[PDB]
Design a protein around this motif. Structure first.
Motif, PDB file in Angstrom:
ATOM      1  N   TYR B  86       0.841  -1.207   0.000  1.00 40.11           N
ATOM      2  CA  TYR B  86       0.000   0.000   0.000  1.00 40.11           C
ATOM      3  C   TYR B  86       0.878   1.261   0.000  1.00 40.11           C
ATOM      4  CZ  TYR B  86      -3.719  -3.332   0.698  1.00 40.11           C
ATOM      5  OH  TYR B  86      -4.599  -4.386   0.514  1.00 40.11           O
ATOM      6  N   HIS B  87       0.505   2.228  -0.833  1.00 45.14           N
ATOM      7  CA  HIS B  87       1.268   3.452  -1.008  1.00 45.14           C
ATOM      8  C   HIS B  87       0.382   4.625  -0.674  1.00 45.14           C
ATOM      9  CE1 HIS B  87       4.255   1.273  -3.401  1.00 45.14           C
ATOM     10  NE2 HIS B  87       3.300   0.836  -4.213  1.00 45.14           N
ATOM     11  N   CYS B  88       0.837   5.523   0.191  1.00 46.56           N
ATOM     12  CA  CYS B  88       0.086   6.763   0.380  1.00 46.56           C
ATOM     13  C   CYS B  88       0.702   7.802  -0.535  1.00 46.56           C
ATOM     14  CB  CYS B  88       0.100   7.250   1.835  1.00 46.56           C
ATOM     15  SG  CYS B  88       1.739   7.805   2.380  1.00 46.56           S
ATOM     16  N   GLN B  89      -0.034   8.873  -0.815  1.00 45.30           N
ATOM     17  CA  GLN B  89       0.410   9.859  -1.809  1.00 45.30           C
ATOM     18  C   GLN B  89      -0.197  11.218  -1.481  1.00 45.30           C
ATOM     19  OE1 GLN B  89      -1.796  10.468  -5.256  1.00 45.30           O
ATOM     20  NE2 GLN B  89      -0.084  10.761  -6.685  1.00 45.30           N
ATOM     21  N   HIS B  90       0.637  12.244  -1.354  1.00 48.10           N
ATOM     22  CA  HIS B  90       0.128  13.603  -1.315  1.00 48.10           C
ATOM     23  C   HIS B  90       0.018  14.028  -2.758  1.00 48.10           C
ATOM     24  CE1 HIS B  90       1.081  18.141  -1.109  1.00 48.10           C
ATOM     25  NE2 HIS B  90      -0.204  17.973  -0.873  1.00 48.10           N
ATOM     26  N   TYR B  91      -1.158  14.480  -3.175  1.00 48.06           N
ATOM     27  CA  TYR B  91      -1.290  14.983  -4.542  1.00 48.06           C
ATOM     28  C   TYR B  91      -1.620  16.467  -4.549  1.00 48.06           C
ATOM     29  CZ  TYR B  91      -6.233  13.867  -3.696  1.00 48.06           C
ATOM     30  OH  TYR B  91      -7.510  13.801  -3.186  1.00 48.06           O
ATOM     31  N   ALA B  92      -0.840  17.224  -5.321  1.00 47.28           N
ATOM     32  CA  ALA B  92      -1.080  18.651  -5.514  1.00 47.28           C
ATOM     33  C   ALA B  92      -1.441  18.876  -6.976  1.00 47.28           C
ATOM     34  CB  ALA B  92       0.150  19.451  -5.138  1.00 47.28           C
ATOM     35  N   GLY B  93      -1.819  20.098  -7.327  1.00 47.30           N
ATOM     36  CA  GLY B  93      -2.273  20.357  -8.680  1.00 47.30           C
ATOM     37  C   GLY B  93      -1.316  19.895  -9.767  1.00 47.30           C
TER      38      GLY B  93
END
Ligand SMILES: O=C(O)[C@@]1(O)C[C@@H](O)[C@@H](O[C@H]2O[C@H](CO[C@H]3O[C@H](CO)[C@@H](O)[C@H](O)[C@@H]3O)[C@@H](O)[C@H](O[C@H]3O[C@H](CO)[C@@H](O)[C@H](O)[C@@H]3O[C@H]3O[C@H](CO)[C@@H](O)[C@H](O)[C@@H]3O[C@H]3O[C@H](CO)[C@@H](O)[C@H](O)[C@@H]3O)[C@@H]2O)[C@@H]([C@H](O)CO)O1
Ligand SMILES: O=C(O)[C@@]1(O)C[C@@H](O)[C@@H](O[C@H]2O[C@H](CO[C@H]3O[C@H](CO)[C@@H](O)[C@H](O)[C@@H]3O)[C@@H](O)[C@H](O[C@H]3O[C@H](CO)[C@@H](O)[C@H](O)[C@@H]3O[C@H]3O[C@H](CO)[C@@H](O)[C@H](O)[C@@H]3O[C@H]3O[C@H](CO)[C@@H](O)[C@H](O)[C@@H]3O)[C@@H]2O)[C@@H]([C@H](O)CO)O1
Lengths: 220, 213, 224, 213
Positions: B86-93
């Motif tokens: 499992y991978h977490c991810q901060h996503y920005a524009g």
């Protein structure tokens, strides 16, 4: 001053894919129809593809239609050539070229060329594996296997004794060698007291090259 | 410039368990956080976004919570299909950053590897090449190290390895390492050894053979 | 069902260049920010590059800034990644990924990914030749002349220089254009014709210089 | 989709000569014709466009004429640097067609090759590969045919050739052909031969050896 330079050339196996790019210096590509041309080993040039301003028109040589795509990136001044289903006769030096003149007209010659990038398509699109025994010899428990070596592309499948032997079997993920060919091993653990009585035969199948190989693994 | 730290790196559990994976951001990212599942050799699959919204098709045993700097992925009632990374991810524009990833695996007792070494077959040698193979069989947990020694000189750059996925029946792993030399170099030396380090062993194990014997 | 497919992965030498493309099925890329992400051997995912709609903004992971370029082609629906000055730690599976959701917003997760293409950078930028004699024999001797040479095989990259007896022997020497083998390594031959009467009296040595690997080999070529 | 035919394919001349390359189009292309010079390993250079316009910097000894279907590139007072390949090109707005190219070389008398064959070295053989080398030495013109035969069977797909550029001293060419086999393949056969055909040879020359001597 005006320069182009191509990147991406390389060695590819028949049926494979390769993408080339072209960058420039001291002009912008936006106003120019950009071209790809190749010099085949015979020495002649062959026009390959053209992409107009705004990408309105993309045109290809019949020999590459359906297989090649040209793209342009005006904002960063790059042009691209995708090559798929590649064939031996695609082997050539590829040049990026612009149509240009001191004043641009509706039809100017190729006034600036890149130095070129070498593309080579080797003839074999697959290659079957060489299979070698991993011969046995910790008491009670023995281990043996087959080394499946130098094949392309993936996958191979390995069974043992046409499948009757499934317990204790491990078939490992293939690795990609520096040679660009794959290699894997399949091993089985068995009673140290069945070697010479029980026969052990690994059955390798390489569908891509319609190759099937049975190999007896014996002690020593 | 937002560093995402995921914990733990490996989470061993059993079918039926409820497990929790934590993701921490070096600074506040509100709820701009997504969780992905990925199985070996497959593409990542989006499970949860905006910290807590499940994608269509994602079973209800998966849930997510958190905002700011601390986020949690929960799986309530682990099923076989759920063992994966499992991978977490901060996503920005226009950019994103991922945590290191968390491998969820089946828990079992420590098991030392059985180690075997195989000299090159005479046939291969005849064609100019010498592959020596070292097998580490049915060990747990997954971390293991192989060091090749030739006449007691440690090797590097000339070996590759691959590891099996967790065994269906005994939940163990196995590893295969291949040392490759030209026939010429192989015949320059006598002692080939593979030295294995693994938590199941009280100390490193060596298996060796003398060329020719 | 929405689909993405990467093309172009393979084996690359350190310092080398490789370009990937990404094509799609069952949607148009125009409204979507498109991304490249890679899974490194250790198992973690790494964001590599993103390109906004209209190519207004291009952003890159610091690790690749200056070496990679991302481009898009909205008309035929392709995304490209140029990789230059490649490093071993560029080794990974590369995926093309779409930023999106049921209804687009200013900030959506990656909702569709390609299967990934494998890119492997070998540590070796260079490889040194093996050099084998082309020994003079009855099959390369006729009348007043004998031919001998060296086969310089399995090196990378070009070029290699060949001299005979450290430059003393220049007359009659032919060093052929190198040729590229299906293995991806070059090979060439250098030959020289000399008086048949001199074999056994004159020593002949080919001096091979592979500057790119700074390797030099001196090979004595003798009868039989 | 216009076919462009240059003539000749190879043009043999001496320094100071005045020479003329012809380009014919399979249908009228008005004056949409350009001529390019290209030297080995280098990029094509635009010399002339619109049939007769000299690009700035191009010496007045280069001159182009023609229209409709027939075009000529004339070099008056050929200089050593003019020895190169010349390509004509029909250029249209969104596509182009090239001729096959004309290589301009130094004129000399026909010269048969001297042919030599080299078995694989014992050292290479031991390493698992057999390269067999056929050498064609100092011949003219450049066109030569080389065929490998293994136990009288014509070979295809397992050899590569390399030709030298025109020799600075005698204006001849030299050629190398390498037949590559695995040790195992190589050891399945006895007689290895290269058969050379060339305009200066009364009949073909065949060089051969028996594996093992
Ligand atoms: O947007 C406009 O300005 C305009 O309104 C101008 C209009 O005139 C008209 O443009 C069309 O017609 C133009 C003129 O056509 C007539 O006169 C021409 C002589 O000037 C003659 O050749 C033609 O047969 C006819 O008699 C054309 O020039 C226009 O064509 C250009 O634009 C289109 C895109 O709409 C391109 O597809 C064409 O290739 C061409 O662009 C190329 O040439 C011009 C210069 O002529 C460059 O400015 C441009 O950057 C581009 O140049 C590159 O490509 C050419 C061809 O490969 C190369 O030779 C150059 O070296 C460059 O690499 C168009 O047909 C209207 C249109 O109706 C729609 O806008 O547009
Ligand atoms: O008619 C117009 O086009 C319009 O007049 C609309 C105006 O609103 C304005 O657009 C700008 O402002 C919009 C609203 O901004 C404000 O409210 C937002 C909340 O909804 C808030 O986030 C924002 O910060 C501010 O408070 C913005 O939505 C506009 O931004 C969009 O358009 C610009 C181009 O002008 C793009 O560069 C942006 O990335 C964004 O486009 C992306 O999102 C929209 C959905 O909102 C998609 O329709 C679009 O295809 C694109 O989607 C893709 O990319 C995003 C981001 O990577 C992903 O998250 C998606 O999944 C897709 O991959 C804009 O700032 C004016 C403009 O000023 C000029 O026209 O335009």
């Amino acid at each position: 001053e005006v320069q182009l330079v191509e990147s991406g050339g390389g060695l590819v196996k028949a049926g494979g894919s390769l993408i080339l790019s072209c960058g420039v210096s001291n002009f912008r590509i936006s106003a120019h129809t950009m071209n790809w041309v190749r010099r085949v080993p015979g020495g002649g040039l062959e026009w390959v593809a053209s992409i107009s301003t705004s990408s309105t028109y993309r045109d290809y040589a019949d020999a590459v239609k359906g297989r090649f795509t040209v793209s342009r990136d005006d904002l960063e001044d790059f042009v691209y050539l995708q090559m798929h289903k590649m064939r031996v006769e695609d082997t050539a030096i590829y040049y990026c070229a612009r149509k240009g003149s001191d004043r641009l007209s509706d039809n100017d010659p190729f006034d600036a060329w890149g130095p070129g990038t070498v593309v080579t398509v080797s003839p074999a699109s697959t290659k079957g594996p060489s299979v070698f025994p991993l011969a046995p010899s910790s008491g009670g428990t023995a281990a043996l296997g087959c080394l499946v070596k130098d094949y392309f592309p993936e996958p191979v499948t390995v069974s043992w004794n046409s499948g009757a032997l499934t317990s204790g079997v491990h078939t490992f993920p293939a690795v990609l060698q520096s040679s660009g060919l794959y290699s894997l091993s399949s091993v089985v653990t068995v009673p140290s007291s069945s070697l010479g009585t029980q026969t052990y035969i690994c059955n390798v199948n390489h569908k891509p090259s319609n190759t099937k190989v049975d190999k007896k693994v014996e002690p020593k | 410039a937002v560093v995402m730290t995921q914990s733990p790196s490996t989470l061993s559990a059993s079918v039926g368990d409820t497990i929790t994976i934590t993701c921490r951001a070096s600074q506040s990212i509100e709820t701009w956080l997504a969780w992905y599942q990925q199985k070996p050799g497959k593409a990542p699959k989006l499970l949860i976004y905006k910290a807590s919204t499940l994608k269509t098709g994602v079973p209800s045993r998966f849930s997510g919570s958190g905002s700011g700097t601390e986020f949690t992925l929960t799986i309530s009632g682990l099923q076989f299909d759920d063992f994966a990374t499992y991978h977490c991810q901060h996503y920005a524009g226009y950019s994103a950053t991922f945590g290191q990833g968390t491998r969820v695996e089946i828990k079992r007792t420590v098991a030392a590897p059985s180690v075997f070494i195989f000299p090159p077959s005479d046939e291969q040698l005849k064609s100019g090449t010498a592959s020596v193979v070292c097998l580490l069989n049915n060990f747990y947990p997954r971390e293991a190290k192989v060091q090749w020694k030739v006449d007691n000189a440690l090797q590097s750059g000339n070996s590759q390895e691959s590891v099996t996925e967790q065994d269906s029946k005994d939940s163990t792993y196995s590893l295969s390492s291949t040392l490759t030399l030209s026939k010429a170099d192989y015949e320059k030396h006598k002692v080939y050894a593979c030295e294995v380090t693994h938590q199941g062993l009280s100390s490193p194990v060596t298996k060796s053979f003398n060329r020719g014997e």
